[PDB]
């Protein structure tokens with residue numbers, strides 16, 4: 078009744094803010110997942126959850142935690158992964174940066190930056206922050222320099238994801254150059 082809604086809501090917020098990948102979910106750039114996919118993910122822990130139950134959680138949430146648009150759902154705040162909540166485009170940046178561990182560099186040079194268990198990749202306007210973000214993934218980080226105008230001309234819109242972080246669907250190898 079009351080504890081039911083709270084325990085399901087706690088899982089909902091964790092999934093939507095923190096680790097959609099632990100449930101096989103891939104949010105779009107605005108942080109939405111489909112309502113059906115979220116229900117199926119909740120159902121693995123609480124089999125009694127239905128779409129109507131999730132809708133009532135959203136409608137009755139005292140803090141504005143969630144938003145349903147059409148048949149997709151997101152958390153409105155508190156994300157620990159890069160999102161562009163208002164879909165606001167970065168049009169001014171000329172160069173973006175991504176740090177790749179030297180071990181992962183062969184596949185990235187051939188294929189570019191491809192999204193993995195996510196719908197988009199993340200890069201930075203700042204080369205030092207790009208290298209620090211890459212260091213989290215392994216040693217001997219190699220700096221990739223990304224031509225933002227090449228990305229836009231190729232049809233990839235670049236979105237602001239807070240401070241110096243940007244997200245984009247993928248980065249083709251043609252928009253990438255190496256640096257020490």
Ligand SMILES: Nc1ncnc2c1ncn2[C@@H]1O[C@H](COP(=O)(O)O)[C@@H](OP(=O)(O)O)[C@H]1OP(=O)(O)O
Pocket residue numbers: 083086087088090091094140142155
């Ligand atoms: N009823 C509910 N529905 C969803 N989520 C809930 C929740 N009741 C609590 N949470 C979240 O638990 C985290 C620690 O909260 P406390 O123990 O400090 O109160 C924090 O989430 P996070 O770790 O992402 O910041 C809270 O979310 P919120 O701040 O929205 O209540």
